[PDB]
Design a protein around this ligand. Structure first.
Ligand SMILES: [Cl-]
Length: 129
């Protein structure tokens, strides 16, 4: 599923990501855009053999189990494939744990490099939220 911008915004708000850990909704939509281009089926292979999954490109090195990342962790206790569902509940729940581990949204490189410092509010502008 490829979300619409406001559609995703609505779904994320519904799941309580708006201002979660102080990150206003625009941050999350901004991150989703550059990580996955709003596509839940997005995957990307990393150098070390791990793989990023889903709309927020959550990595199997720590956060989910894909059965091919040896010595890794599964801190969100989920199969990585679950992060590819059209329903973003799993991704959101897992993201909440990630953003809480102490490094905030800097955990997403695309956010840090492309969203941090910019007018993230622009990403939910026009949306009926
Ligand atoms: Cl991540």
């Amino acid at each position: 599923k490829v979300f619409g911008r406001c559609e995703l915004a609505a779904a994320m708000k519904r799941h309580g990501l708006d201002n979660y850990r102080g990150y206003s909704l625009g941050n999350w939509v901004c991150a989703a855009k550059f990580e996955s281009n709003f596509n839940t089926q997005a995957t990307n292979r990393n150098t070390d053999g791990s793989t990023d999954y889903g709309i927020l490109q959550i990595n199997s090195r720590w956060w989910c189990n894909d059965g091919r990342t040896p010595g890794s962790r599964n801190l969100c206790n989920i199969p990585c494939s679950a992060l590819l569902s059209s329903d973003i509940t799993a991704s959101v729940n897992c993201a909440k744990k990630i953003v809480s581990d102490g490094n905030g949204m800097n955990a997403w490189v695309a956010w840090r490099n492309r969203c941090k410092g910019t007018d993230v509010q622009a990403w939910i502008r026009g949306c009926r939220l």
